[PDB]
Short mmCIF file of C-alpha atoms in Angstrom, two decimals:
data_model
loop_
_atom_site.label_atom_id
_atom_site.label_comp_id
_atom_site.label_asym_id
_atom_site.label_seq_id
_atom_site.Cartn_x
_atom_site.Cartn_y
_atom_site.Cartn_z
CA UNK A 4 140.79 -86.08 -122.55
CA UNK A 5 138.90 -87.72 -119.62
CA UNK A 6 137.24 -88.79 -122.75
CA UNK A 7 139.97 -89.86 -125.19
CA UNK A 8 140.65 -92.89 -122.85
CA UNK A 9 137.40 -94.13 -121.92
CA UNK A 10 136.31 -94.14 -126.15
CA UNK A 11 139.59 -95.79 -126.74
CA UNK A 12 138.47 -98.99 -123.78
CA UNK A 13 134.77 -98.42 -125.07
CA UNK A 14 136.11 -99.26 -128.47
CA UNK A 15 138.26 -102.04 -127.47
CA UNK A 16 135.06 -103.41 -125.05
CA UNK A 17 133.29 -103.24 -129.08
CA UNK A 18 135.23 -106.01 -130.20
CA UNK A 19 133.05 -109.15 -130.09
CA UNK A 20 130.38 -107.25 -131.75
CA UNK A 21 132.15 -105.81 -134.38
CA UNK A 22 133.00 -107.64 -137.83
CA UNK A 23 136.99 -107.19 -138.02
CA UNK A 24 140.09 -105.63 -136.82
CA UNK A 25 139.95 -102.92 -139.82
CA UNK A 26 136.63 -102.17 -138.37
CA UNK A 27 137.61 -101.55 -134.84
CA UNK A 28 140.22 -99.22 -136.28
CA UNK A 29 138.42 -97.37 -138.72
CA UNK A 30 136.05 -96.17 -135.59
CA UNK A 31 138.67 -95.47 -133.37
CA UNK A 32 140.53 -93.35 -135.81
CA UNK A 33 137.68 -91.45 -137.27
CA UNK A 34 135.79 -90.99 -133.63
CA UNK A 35 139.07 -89.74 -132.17
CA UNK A 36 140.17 -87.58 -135.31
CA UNK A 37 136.53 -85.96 -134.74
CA UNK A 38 136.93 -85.61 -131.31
CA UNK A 39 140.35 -83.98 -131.84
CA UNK A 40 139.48 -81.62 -134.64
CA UNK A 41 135.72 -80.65 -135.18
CA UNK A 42 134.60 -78.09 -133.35
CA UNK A 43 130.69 -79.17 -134.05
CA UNK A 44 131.46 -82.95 -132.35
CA UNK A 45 133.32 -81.35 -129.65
CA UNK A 46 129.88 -79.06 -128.68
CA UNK A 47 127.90 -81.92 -129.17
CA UNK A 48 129.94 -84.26 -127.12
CA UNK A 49 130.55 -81.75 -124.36
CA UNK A 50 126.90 -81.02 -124.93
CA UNK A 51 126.14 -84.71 -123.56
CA UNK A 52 127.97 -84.67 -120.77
CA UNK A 53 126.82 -81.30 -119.56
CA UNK A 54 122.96 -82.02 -120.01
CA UNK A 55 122.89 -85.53 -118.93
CA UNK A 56 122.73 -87.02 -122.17
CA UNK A 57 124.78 -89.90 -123.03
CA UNK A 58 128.66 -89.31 -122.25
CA UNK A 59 130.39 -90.60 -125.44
CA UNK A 60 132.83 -93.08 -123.31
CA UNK A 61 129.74 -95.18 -122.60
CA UNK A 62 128.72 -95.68 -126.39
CA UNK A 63 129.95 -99.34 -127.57
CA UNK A 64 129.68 -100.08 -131.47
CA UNK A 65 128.07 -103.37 -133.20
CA UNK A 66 127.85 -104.33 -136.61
CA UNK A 67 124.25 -105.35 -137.07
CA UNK A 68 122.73 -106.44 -139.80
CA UNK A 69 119.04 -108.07 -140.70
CA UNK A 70 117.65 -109.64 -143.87
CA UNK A 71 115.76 -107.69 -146.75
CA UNK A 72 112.40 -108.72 -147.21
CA UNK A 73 112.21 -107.49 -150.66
CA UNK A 74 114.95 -110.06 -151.35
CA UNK A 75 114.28 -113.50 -153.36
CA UNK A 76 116.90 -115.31 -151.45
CA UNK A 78 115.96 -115.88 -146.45
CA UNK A 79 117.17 -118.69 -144.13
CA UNK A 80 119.70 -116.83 -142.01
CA UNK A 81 122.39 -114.38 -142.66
CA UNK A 82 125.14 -116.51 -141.59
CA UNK A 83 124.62 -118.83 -144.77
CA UNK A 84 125.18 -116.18 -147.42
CA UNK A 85 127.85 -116.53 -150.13
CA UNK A 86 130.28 -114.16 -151.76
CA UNK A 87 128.31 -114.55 -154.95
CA UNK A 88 125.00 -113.84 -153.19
CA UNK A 89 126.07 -110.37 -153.00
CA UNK A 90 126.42 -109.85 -156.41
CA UNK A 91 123.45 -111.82 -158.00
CA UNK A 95 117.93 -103.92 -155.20
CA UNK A 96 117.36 -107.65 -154.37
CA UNK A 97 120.02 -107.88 -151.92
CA UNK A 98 120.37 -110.04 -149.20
CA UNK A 99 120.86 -107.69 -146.24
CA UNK A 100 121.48 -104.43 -145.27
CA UNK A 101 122.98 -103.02 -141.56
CA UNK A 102 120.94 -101.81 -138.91
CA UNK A 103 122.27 -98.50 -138.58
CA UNK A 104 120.28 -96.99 -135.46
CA UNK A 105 121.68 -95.67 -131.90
CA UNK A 106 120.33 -98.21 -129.68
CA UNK A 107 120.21 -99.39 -126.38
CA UNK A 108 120.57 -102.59 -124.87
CA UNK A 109 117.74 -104.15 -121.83
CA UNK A 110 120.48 -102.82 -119.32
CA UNK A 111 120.04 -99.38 -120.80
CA UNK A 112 123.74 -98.64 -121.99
CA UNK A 113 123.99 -97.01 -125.16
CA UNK A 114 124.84 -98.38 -128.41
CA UNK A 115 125.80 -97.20 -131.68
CA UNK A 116 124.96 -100.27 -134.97
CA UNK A 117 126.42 -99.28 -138.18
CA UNK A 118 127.65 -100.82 -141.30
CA UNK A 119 131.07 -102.26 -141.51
CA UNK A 120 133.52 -100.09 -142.72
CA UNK A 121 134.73 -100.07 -146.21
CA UNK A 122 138.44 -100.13 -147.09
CA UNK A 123 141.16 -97.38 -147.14
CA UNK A 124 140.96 -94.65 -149.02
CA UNK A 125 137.44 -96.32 -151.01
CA UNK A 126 135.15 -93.90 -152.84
CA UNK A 127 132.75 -94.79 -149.62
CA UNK A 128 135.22 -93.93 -146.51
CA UNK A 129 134.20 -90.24 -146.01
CA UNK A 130 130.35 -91.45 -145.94
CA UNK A 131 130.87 -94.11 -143.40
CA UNK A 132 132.54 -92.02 -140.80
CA UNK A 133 130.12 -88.94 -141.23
CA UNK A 134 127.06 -91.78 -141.18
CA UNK A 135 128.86 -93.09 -137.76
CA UNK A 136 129.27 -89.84 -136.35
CA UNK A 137 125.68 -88.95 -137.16
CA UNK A 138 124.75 -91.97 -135.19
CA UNK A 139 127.13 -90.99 -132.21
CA UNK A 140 125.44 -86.98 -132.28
CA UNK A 141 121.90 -88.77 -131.74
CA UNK A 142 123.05 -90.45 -128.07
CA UNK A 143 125.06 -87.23 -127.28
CA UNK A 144 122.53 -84.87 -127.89
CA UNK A 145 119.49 -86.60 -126.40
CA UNK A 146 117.99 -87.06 -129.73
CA UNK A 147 115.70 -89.88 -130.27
CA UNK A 157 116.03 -85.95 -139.03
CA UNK A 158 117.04 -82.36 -140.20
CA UNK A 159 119.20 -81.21 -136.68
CA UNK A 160 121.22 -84.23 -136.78
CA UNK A 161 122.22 -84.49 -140.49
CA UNK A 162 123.02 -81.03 -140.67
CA UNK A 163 125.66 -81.54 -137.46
CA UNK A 164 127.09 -84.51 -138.45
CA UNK A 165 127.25 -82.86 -142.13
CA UNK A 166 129.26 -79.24 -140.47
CA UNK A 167 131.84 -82.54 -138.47
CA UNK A 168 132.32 -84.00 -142.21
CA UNK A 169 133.06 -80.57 -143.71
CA UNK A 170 135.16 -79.29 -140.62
CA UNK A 171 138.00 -82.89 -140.72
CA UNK A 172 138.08 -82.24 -144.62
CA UNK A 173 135.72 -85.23 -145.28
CA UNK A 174 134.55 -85.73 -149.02
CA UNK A 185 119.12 -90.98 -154.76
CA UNK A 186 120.34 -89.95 -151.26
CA UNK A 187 118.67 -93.33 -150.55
CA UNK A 188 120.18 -95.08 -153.62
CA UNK A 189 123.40 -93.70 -152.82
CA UNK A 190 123.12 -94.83 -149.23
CA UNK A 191 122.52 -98.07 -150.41
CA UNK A 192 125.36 -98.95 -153.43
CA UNK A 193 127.49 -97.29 -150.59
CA UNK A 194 126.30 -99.62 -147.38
CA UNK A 195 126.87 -102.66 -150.07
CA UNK A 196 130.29 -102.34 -151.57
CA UNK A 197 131.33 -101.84 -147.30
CA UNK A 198 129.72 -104.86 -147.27
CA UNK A 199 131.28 -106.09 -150.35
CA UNK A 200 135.14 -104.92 -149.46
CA UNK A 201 134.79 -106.18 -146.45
CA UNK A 202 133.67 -109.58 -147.24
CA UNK A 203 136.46 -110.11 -149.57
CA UNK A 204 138.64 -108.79 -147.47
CA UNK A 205 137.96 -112.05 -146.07
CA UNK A 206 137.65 -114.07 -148.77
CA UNK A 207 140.20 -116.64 -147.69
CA UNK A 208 138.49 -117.02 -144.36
CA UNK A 209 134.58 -116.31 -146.15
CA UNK A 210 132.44 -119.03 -144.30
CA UNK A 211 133.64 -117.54 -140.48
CA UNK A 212 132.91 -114.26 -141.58
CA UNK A 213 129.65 -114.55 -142.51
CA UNK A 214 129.78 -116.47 -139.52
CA UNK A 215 130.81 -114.05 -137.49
CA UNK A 216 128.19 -111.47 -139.05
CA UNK A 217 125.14 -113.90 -138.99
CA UNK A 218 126.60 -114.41 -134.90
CA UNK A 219 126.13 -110.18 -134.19
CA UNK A 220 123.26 -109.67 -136.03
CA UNK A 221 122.08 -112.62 -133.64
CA UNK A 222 122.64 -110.09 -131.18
CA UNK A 223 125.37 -113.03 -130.00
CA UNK A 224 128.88 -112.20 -128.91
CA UNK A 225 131.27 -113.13 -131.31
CA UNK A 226 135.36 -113.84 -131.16
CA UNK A 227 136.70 -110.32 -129.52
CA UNK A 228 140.53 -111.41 -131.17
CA UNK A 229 138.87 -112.06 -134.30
CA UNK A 230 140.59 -115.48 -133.27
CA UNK A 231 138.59 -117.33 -136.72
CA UNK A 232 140.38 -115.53 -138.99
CA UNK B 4 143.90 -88.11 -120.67
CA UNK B 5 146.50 -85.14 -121.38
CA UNK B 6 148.81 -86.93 -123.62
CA UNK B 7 146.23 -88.65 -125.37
CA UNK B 8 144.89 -85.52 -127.23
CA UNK B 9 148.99 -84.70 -127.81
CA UNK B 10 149.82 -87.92 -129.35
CA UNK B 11 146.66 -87.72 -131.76
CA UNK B 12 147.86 -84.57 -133.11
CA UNK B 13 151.39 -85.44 -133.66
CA UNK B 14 150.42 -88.14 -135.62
CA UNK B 15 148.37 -85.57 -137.59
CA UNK B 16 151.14 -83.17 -137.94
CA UNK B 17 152.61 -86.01 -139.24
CA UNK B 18 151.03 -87.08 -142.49
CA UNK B 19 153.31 -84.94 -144.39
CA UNK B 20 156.53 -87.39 -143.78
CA UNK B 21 154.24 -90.29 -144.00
CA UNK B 22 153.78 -92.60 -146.79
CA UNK B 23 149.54 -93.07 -147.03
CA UNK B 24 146.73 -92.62 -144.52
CA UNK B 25 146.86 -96.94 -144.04
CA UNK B 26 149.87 -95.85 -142.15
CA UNK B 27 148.96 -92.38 -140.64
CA UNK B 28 145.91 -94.79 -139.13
CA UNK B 29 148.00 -97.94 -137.86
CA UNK B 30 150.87 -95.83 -136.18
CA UNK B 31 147.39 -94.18 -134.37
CA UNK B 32 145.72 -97.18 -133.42
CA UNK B 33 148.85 -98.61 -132.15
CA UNK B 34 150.23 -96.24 -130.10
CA UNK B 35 147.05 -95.39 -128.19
CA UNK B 36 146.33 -98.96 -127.74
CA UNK B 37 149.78 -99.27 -126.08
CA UNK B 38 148.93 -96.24 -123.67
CA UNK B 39 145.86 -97.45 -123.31
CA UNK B 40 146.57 -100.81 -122.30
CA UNK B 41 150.05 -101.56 -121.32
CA UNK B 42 151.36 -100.76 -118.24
CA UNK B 43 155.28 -100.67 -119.07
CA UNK B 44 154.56 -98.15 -122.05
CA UNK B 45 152.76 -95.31 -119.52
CA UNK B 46 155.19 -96.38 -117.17
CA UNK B 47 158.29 -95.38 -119.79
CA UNK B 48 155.95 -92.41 -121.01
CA UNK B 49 155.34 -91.50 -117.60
CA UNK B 50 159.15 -91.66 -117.23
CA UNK B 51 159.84 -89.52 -119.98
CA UNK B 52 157.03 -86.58 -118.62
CA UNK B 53 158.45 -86.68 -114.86
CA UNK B 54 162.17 -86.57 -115.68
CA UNK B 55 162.30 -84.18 -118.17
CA UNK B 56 162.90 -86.79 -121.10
CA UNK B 57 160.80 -86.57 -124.41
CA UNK B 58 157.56 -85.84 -123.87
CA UNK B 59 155.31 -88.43 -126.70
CA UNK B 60 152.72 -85.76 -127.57
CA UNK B 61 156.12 -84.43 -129.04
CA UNK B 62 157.53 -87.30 -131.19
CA UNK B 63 156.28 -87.06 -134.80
CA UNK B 64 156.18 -89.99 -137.53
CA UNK B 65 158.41 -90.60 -140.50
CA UNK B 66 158.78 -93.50 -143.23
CA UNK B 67 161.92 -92.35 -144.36
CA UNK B 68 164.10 -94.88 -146.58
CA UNK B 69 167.74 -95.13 -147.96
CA UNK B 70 169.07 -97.03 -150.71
CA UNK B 71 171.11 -100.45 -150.37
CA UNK B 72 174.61 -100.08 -151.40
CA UNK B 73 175.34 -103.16 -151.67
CA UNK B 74 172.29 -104.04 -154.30
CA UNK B 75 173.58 -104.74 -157.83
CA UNK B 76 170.35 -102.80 -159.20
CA UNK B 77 170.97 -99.13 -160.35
CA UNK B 78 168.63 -96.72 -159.64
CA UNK B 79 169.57 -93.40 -159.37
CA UNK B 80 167.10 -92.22 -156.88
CA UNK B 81 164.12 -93.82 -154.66
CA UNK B 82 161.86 -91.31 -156.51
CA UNK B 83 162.95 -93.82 -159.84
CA UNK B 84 162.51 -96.88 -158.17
CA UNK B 85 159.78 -99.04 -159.45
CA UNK B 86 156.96 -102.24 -158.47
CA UNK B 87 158.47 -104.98 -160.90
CA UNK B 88 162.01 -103.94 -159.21
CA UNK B 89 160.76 -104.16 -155.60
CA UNK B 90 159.39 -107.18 -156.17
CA UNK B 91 161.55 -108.67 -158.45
CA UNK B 92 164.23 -109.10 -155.94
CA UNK B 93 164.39 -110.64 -152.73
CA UNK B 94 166.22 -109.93 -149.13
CA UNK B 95 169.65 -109.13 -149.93
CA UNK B 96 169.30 -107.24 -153.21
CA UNK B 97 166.67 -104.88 -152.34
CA UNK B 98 167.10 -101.35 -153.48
CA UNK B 99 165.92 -99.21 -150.09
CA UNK B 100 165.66 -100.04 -146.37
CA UNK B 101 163.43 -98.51 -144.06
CA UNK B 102 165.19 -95.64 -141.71
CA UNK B 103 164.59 -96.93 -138.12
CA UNK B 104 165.72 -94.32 -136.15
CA UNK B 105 164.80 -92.32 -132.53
CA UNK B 106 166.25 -89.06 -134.04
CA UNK B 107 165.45 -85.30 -133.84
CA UNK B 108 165.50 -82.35 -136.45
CA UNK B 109 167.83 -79.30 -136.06
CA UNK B 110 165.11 -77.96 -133.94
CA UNK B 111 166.21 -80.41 -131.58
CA UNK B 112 161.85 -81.74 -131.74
CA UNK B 113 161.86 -85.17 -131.99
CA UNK B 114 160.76 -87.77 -134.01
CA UNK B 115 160.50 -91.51 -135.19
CA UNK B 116 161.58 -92.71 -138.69
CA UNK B 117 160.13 -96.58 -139.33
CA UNK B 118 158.77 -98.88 -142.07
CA UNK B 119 155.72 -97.81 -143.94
CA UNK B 120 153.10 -100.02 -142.20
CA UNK B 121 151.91 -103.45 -143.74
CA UNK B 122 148.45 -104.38 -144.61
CA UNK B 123 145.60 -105.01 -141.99
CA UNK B 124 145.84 -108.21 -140.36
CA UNK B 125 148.79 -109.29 -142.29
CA UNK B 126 151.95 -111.33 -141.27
CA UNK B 127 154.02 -108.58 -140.41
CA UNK B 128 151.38 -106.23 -138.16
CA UNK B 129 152.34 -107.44 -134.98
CA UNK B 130 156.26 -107.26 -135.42
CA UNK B 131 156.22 -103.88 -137.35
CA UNK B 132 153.78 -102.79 -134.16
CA UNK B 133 156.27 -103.87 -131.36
CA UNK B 134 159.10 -102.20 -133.74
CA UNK B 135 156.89 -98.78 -133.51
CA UNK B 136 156.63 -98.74 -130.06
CA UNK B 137 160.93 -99.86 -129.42
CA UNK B 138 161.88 -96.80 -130.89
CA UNK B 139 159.36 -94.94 -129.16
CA UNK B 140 160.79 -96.60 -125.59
CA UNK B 141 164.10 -94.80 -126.72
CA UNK B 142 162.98 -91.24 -126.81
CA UNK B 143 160.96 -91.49 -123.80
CA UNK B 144 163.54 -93.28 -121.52
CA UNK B 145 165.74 -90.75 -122.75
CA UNK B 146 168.02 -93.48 -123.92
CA UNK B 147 170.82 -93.68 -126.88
CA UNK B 157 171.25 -102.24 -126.41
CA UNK B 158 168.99 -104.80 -124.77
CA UNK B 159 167.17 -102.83 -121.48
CA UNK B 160 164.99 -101.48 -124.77
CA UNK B 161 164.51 -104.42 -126.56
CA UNK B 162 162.77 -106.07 -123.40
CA UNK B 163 161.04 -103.23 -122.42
CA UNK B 164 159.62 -103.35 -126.07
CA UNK B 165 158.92 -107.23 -126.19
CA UNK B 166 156.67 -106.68 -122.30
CA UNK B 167 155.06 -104.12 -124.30
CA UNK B 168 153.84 -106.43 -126.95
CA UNK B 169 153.26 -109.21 -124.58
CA UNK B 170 151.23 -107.06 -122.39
CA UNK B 171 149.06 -106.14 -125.21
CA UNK B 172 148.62 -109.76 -127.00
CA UNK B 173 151.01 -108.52 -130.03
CA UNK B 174 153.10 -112.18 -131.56
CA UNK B 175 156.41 -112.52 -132.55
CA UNK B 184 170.99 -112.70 -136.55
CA UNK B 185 167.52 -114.84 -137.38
CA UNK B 186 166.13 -111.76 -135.52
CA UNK B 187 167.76 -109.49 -138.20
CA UNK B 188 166.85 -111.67 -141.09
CA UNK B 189 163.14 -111.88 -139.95
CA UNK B 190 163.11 -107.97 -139.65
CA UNK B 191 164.84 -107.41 -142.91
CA UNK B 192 161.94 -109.59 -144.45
CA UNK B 193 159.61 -107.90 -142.48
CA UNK B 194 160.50 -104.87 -144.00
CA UNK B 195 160.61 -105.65 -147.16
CA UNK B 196 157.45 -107.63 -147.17
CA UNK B 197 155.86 -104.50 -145.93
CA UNK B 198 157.28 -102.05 -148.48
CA UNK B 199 156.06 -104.91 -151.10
CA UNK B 200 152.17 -104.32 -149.55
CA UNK B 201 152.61 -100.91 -149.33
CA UNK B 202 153.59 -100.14 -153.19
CA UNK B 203 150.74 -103.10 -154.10
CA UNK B 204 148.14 -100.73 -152.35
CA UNK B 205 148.77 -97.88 -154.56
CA UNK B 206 148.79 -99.78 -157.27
CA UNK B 207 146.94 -96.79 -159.28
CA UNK B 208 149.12 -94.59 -158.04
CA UNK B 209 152.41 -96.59 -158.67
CA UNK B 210 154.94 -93.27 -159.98
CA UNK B 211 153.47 -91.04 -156.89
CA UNK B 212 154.20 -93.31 -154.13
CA UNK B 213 158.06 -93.52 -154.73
CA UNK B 214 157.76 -89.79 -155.66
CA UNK B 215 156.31 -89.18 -152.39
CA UNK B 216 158.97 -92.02 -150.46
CA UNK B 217 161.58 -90.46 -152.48
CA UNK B 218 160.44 -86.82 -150.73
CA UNK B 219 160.27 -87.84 -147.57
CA UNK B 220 163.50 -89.89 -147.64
CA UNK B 221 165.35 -86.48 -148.83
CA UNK B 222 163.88 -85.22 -145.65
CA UNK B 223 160.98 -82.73 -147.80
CA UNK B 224 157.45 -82.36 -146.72
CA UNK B 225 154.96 -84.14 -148.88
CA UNK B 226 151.67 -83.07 -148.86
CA UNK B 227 149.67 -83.72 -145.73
CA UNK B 228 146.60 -84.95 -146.89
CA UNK B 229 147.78 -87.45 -150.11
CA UNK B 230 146.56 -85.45 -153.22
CA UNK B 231 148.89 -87.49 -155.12
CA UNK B 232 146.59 -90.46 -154.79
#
C-alpha cells in the first residue's frame, strides 16, 4: 500500500517511454489487479523488498523494440509502414528483457499492449508480470515462468515460440492501427524509444 | 497507501453493475490517477475519512441507464434496444440516458451510477473523467450546486484533463459514448443491452463478462 502509490507515479514517470495512453493503462491496471489479488505476486513482491532485491515502486516500463535480422526489409524502425507489417520476415519484434539503465535503476521493456478484451490480452499481462518477478526476485527460465504462470491462473487469466510471436505482432498490429490516423508519429514515436530517446510523455503527437 | 488497495477492490466488486472491462479499467485508471496526483481530490477524500463522510474504498461503480420519455421511438425495454436505433437518432430523440447519480442501496453502502466510458483517447475521455470524479466529490464531502462543480473542474485542471451549452455538450457526450460503447461489442450486439438492460433494473450481471 506503501507500494500501490509509488507503482502508480512509477507508471506515470513511464510515460515518455511508453508507446500510448492505452499502454500506460493496460500496465497500471494489470500490475495493480496483480498486486491486489495474487497471492504468488504478492510473495514475490514482498519477497523483493525483504531481501534487497528490487522494490517494485522503482521498476519504470519502456516499449523497446529492435529490427529482425532475418527480415528482407532495415534502415530504421521509425520508417516502417502499416503495410510493412503485413507483407516470419517481419520487421521488428520488442525487446522484452528486465533491464537496467547506466544509473542502475531497474527497468522492465515489453511489447505494447494489444487491445481490450483481444485473443492476446491475458498473454501480455502474464509476459509483463513475468518480466516484473525477474527484478523482484533477484533473478537474472523454469522458476520464473512457473510464478508468473500460478499469478495468471490465480486473477483468472486465460510453437510456444510461434505463439509468442503471432501474439507480440498483432499487439504490434492493434496498436499501430489504433493509430492509423496519426501512423507516421507513431512509428515515430516507437523508432524514438527503441532509440533509447525520450519521447512525448502526453502523447502530445497524437 | 490504505485507500488505494480499498478503491482497487471496489472497482472489482464492481464489474457486476458495469457495462465491459474498457470501463471497469478507465473508472480504475482514473480514479487512482486523481488520488495520486491531485491535491483537491485527497484533500475531499481526506475530508470524507476524518469527518465521518463516505469513505471511497466504499463507493462502488454503476452504468445504470433509463429510457427517454420524451423519444418518439418505442421500445419496450433497454434489454430491446438496438445499434441501428442508437445510432440512428441524434440528441433529443435518444432512447436511454445515462443514470448520474451519488446514491446508496438499501444497505445504506454507497455507490456511483455514470456513463459507460468512451473509447481510449477519444473526444469525450477527458469530460466523462472529470464527470467520474464530480460525483465522487459528492459522496466524500458528504454533500446533497456549484461548490462541487468547481471542486470537480480544479480536479481536472490539476491533473491536465480538457474541457445550458454545458448540458447540451454533456448530453452529446453521453450519447457519443453509449454510441462507442455498443460499436465495441459489435459481436456481441444482443448481450450488451441485455447486460445494460440488467444493470439498469438494478440486477447483478455477471462479474467477469461471459456474455462477450
Amino acid at each position: 500500500s506503501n507500494v500501490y502509490e509509488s507503482v502508480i507515479r512509477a507508471v506515470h514517470d513511464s510515460r515518455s517511454r511508453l508507446i500510448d495512453q492505452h499502454t500506460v493503462d493496460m500496465i497500471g491496471n494489470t500490475v495493480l489487479d496483480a498486486l491486489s489479488r495474487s497471492q504468488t505476486f504478492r510473495d514475490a513482491v514482498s519477497y523483493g523488498i525483504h531481501n534487497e532485491k528490487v522494490h517494485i515502486g522503482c521498476i519504470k516500463y519502456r516499449n523497446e523494440y529492435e529490427l529482425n535480422e532475418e527480415s528482407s526489409v532495415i534502415d530504421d524502425i521509425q520508417s516502417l509502414t502499416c503495410n510493412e507489417l503485413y507483407e516470419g520476415q517481419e520487421p521488428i519484434f520488442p525487446i522484452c528483457e528486465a533491464g537496467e539503465n547506466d544509473n542502475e535503476e531497474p527497468y522492465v521493456s515489453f511489447s505494447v499492449a494489444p487491445d481490450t478484451d483481444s485473443y492476446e490480452m491475458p498473454s501480455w499481462q502474464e509476459g509483463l508480470i513475468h518480466e516484473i518477478i525477474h527484478h523482484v526476485t533477484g533473478s537474472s527460465l523454469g522458476p520464473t515462468e512457473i510464478l508468473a504462470r500460478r499469478v495468471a491462473q490465480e486473477l483468472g487469466w486465460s510453437e510456444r515460440e510461434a505463439h509468442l510471436r503471432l501474439r507480440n505482432l498483432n499487439a504490434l498490429r492493434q496498436a499501430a492501427m489504433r493509430h492509423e490516423e496519426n501512423e507516421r508519429a507513431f512509428f515515430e514515436r516507437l523508432g524514438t524509444i527503441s532509440d533509447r530517446y525520450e519521447a512525448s510523455p502526453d502523447f502530445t503527437e497524437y
